[PDB]
Amino acid sequence: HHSYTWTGALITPCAAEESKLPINALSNSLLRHHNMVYATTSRSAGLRQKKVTFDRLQVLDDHYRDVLKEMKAKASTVKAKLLSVEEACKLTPPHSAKSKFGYGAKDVRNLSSKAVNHIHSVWKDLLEDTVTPIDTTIMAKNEVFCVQRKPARLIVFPDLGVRVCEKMALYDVVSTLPQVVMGSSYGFQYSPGQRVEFLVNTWKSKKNPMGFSYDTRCFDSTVTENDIRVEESIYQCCDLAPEARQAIKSLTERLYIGGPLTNSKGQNCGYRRCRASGVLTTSCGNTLTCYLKASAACRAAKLQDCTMLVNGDDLVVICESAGVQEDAASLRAFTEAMTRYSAPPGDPPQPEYDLELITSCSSNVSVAHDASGKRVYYLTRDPTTPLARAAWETARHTPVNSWLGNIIMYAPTLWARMILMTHFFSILLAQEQLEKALDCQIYGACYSIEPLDLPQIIERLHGLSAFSLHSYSPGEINRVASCLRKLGVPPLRVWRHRARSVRARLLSQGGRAATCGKYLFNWAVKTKLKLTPIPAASQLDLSGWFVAGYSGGDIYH
Ligand SMILES: CN(C)N(c1cc(C#CC(C)(C)C)sc1C(=O)O)C(=O)[C@H]1CC[C@H](C)CC1
């Protein structure tokens, strides 16, 4: 029951790949230790193939089936609709991978006859054939990190025509089902501020809280044919059109369960019998399966009053403590149960009795103070990867602007405000590009965002306190400072000076630009303004943000 089998053909690049951090005139203003930053390339694909290839064994007990029955009962309340061809086309990112059948993402978005005809033919074929595995392409991802190097992650995805069909059959399902099945445990329904609120309120709801994150080793590879069929059985609990039931059955049999892997040059690389990382159902499937396995494991371990928080393969559990010794024993039992279910750990879990010490989705809860001096909880993370990616983006235009996504998601943090806002608004000003919409990703979905709208977005998501936080925790301050020394980033005095300059120039522009100056950089001046609500904020349609996760699912808004 191997996760993959391989022919020996190589995983190949579809374009020239750079590993070394590109440098321009702006690089040193952000960081000096350039050799610390790198991008992964296909040259390490082989190392990744070795790590992701293993046999899976699965022993399923009564706890597992009990939880599954409960999940199905909730799923049976869901009613889901097919998307029209047009609706599905409009969810396609403008720069999504072109089809091998003579049309591209722009053709799809424009409803061109060629694209629409092909999409219709793929759909008809899904209804007519529920057996033949569907081809997929395997690629090595090019992602940027700071040293201590990782081998490239792999991405596996079907052709554009198939991706459009996935949306038609399953977009409504994967957008609505998880919150119904998992309720408050479904992580993607929360903005960062809402996630912090759920965590804190959950922590406070326990008499003696204990919590832990659980890291499954190579989660996608641990997902078995059983797991993927169980996921389909959950989808089929929904009230669906018969046409939708057939398309979903077909996609499960032909795509989700496994299929051939083809490299960028059309060679057969091998065969997958685990989760594909680049299909619409990757996020929802991982979320449901992680939740199922973990909920059953809690019962096997006899953890008391477990509250889970699940985002794909990312898992946090907060429960009622039974004592330090009992807690540690129960956690080992939990891990043993997860392992029997084919979800063994990478790092062994550790019980935590301080909420701020739990890291999940690479983030943690921390505390600062607003202008009135009151304690405010917010979401932060180690800034190392955000800053390394920011350095790459300083010198190269890339498909996704991580710096923009990070400012949005981590707006209240010491590091995003001091460094990312300052650095990138300086660059935007110099190039007169403040109004140019840029692509970023939020929970895996792609969004086109004008940087001038940032103050409203931030106020809607985080509230006005995001612009006045100060007196950060010693732990957070030290982590940021350590990162700055590691990468060779300039000191606070430098950033404050640059911020005052950026702010001054923004104010002189008037309009939204002045709003950016006033709100984003109020922290940098001696005599601070008392910030009030931004009128146009109400106008933004953020209904669609923070509904569901779409990592790998080729979704655009
Ligand atoms: C108290 N004063 C000196 N601070 C302030 C500066 C801090 C720092 C730092 C290093 C990581 C460079 C060591 S923490 C902090 C703190 O407020 O805890 C502020 O006013 C900050 C408010 C937020 C803004 C983005 C940057 C300045």
CA distances from 313 to 13, 35, 310, 330, 335 (A): 27, 31, 7, 21, 15
DSSP string, 9-31: PPP--SS----BPP--TTHHHH-
159 annotated ligand binder: no
Tokens 């939708």 correspond to 244
Question: What is the H or E stretch that residue 461 is in?
Answer: helix 454-462
Q: Does domain 183-223+281-361 have CATH number 3.30.70.270?
A: yes
- Please give the structure tokens belonging to residue 62: 């009564």
288 phi and psi angles, rounded to 5 deg: -65, -45
Task: Give distance in angstroms: CA of 95 to centre of ligand 1.
Answer: 39
CB 163 within 8 A of CB 157: yes
- Whether residue 107 contacts residue 267, with contact meaning beta carbons closer than 8 Å, is answered with no
Q: Which amino acid is at 394?
A: T
Residue 311 CA to ligand 1 center (angstroms) comes to 31
Q: Quick one: tokens of 272?
A: 């997958």
Angle at 418 between CA 416 and CA 423, to 5 degrees: 85
Residue 217 CA to residue 290 CA, distance in Å, equals: 12
Resolution in A: 1.8
Ligand 1 nearest-atom number relative to CA 470: 17
Ligand 1 pocket test target in 376, 414, 423 with most atoms within 8 Å of CB = 414
The residue behind tokens 């709100």 is 519
CB 75 within 8 A of CB 180: yes
Q: List the residue whose alpha carbon is closest to atom 18 of ligand 1.
A: 471
Helix (H, G, I), strand (E, B) or coil at 271: strand
99 DSSP 8-state letter: P
On the CB side of 211, CA atoms within 13 Å amount to 27
251: its two tokens: 């996609």
Distance between CA atoms of 21 and 190, rounded to whole angstroms?
34
Rounded to whole angstroms, the Cα distance separating 304 from 356 reads 21
> Is 335:300 a contact under the CB 8 Å cutoff?
no
Name the residue among 337, 549, 345, 333 with its Cα closest to residue 445: 549
H/E stretch holding 261 reads: strand 259-262
Are 272 and 162 a contacting pair, CB within 8 Å?
Answer: no
In ligand 1, which atom is closest to the CA atom of 417? 25
Q: Are the CB atoms for 299 and 64 separated by under 8 Å?
A: no
CA distances from 113 to 99, 116, 159, 336, 539 (A): 14, 5, 18, 54, 35
Which residue, among 297, 307, 315, has the nearest Cα to 61 in the 3D structure?
A: 297
The tokens of 250 are what?
């077909």
Cβ atoms of 299 and 172 within 8 Å: the answer is no
Assess contact for 43 and 142: CB atoms under 8 A.
no
Neighbours of 380 (CB within 10 A): 26
DSSP strand E in 411-480: where? Answer: 438-442, 445-449
Encoding tokens for residue 412?
Answer: 């209240």
Spatial contact of 155 and 177, defined as CB atoms under 8 Å apart: no
Q: Is 313 annotated as a binding residue?
A: yes
CA distance 552 to 35: 30
Distance, CA of 445 to CA of 542 (rounded, Å): 13
Q: Which 8-state DSSP code applies to residue 363?
A: B
C-alpha 523 to ligand 1 mean position (Å)? 9
Burial of 433 (0-12, 13-18, 19+ CB in 10 A): exposed
Give helix 282-301 / helix 160-182 axis angle, nearest 10°.
30
3-state percent breakdown (helix, strand, coil) of the chain, nearest 5: 50, 15, 35
Residue whose tokens read 């806002």: 421
Assess contact for 274 and 258: CB atoms under 8 A.
yes
From 417, 421, 492, mutation site for ligand 1 pocket: most ligand atoms within 8 A of C-beta: 492
Task: Count CB-CB contacts under 10 A for residue 132.
Answer: 11
Task: List all residues 6 or more positions away from 257 whose beta carbon is below 8 Å from its beta carbon.
Answer: 225, 228, 229, 273
Instruction: List, in order, residues 6 or more apart from 425 with CB less than 8 Å away.
Output: 434, 451, 502, 506, 516, 520, 521
Domain extents in the chain: 1-55+133-158+258-273, 56-132+159-182+224-257+274-280, 183-223+281-361, 362-557
Task: Give the side-chain half-sphere CA count within 13 A for 61.
Answer: 15
Nearest to 187 by CA among 550, 179, 175, 318: 179
- Of all protein residues, the one whose alpha carbon is nearest to atom 22 of ligand 1 is 470
CB 298 within 8 A of CB 335: no
All residues at 6 or more sequence positions from 153 whose CB lies less than 8 Å from its CB, including other chains: 40, 48, 140, 141, 143, 277
Catalogue the E-assigned strands of 335-421: 364-369, 375-380
Give the separation between CA 185 and CA 521, rounded to whole angstroms: 35
Residues whose CB is less than 8 angstroms from the CB of residue 173 and which lie 6 or more positions away in sequence, other chains included: 78, 80, 235, 238, 240, 248, 284
314 in a known ligand binding site? yes
Q: Which of 300, 302, 309, 304 is closest to 321 using CA atoms? A: 304
List of E strands, 370-452: 375-380, 438-442, 445-449
The pair of three-digit structure tokens given for residue 21, joined into one six-digit string: 């951090």
Q: Which residues line ligand 1 (CB under 6 A)?
A: 414, 417-418, 470-472, 477, 480-481, 484, 492, 523
375: which 2 tokens? Answer: 């304690």
- Cα separation, 229 vs 419, in Å, equals 46
DSSP state of 536: G
Tokens of residue 85, six digits: 């061809």
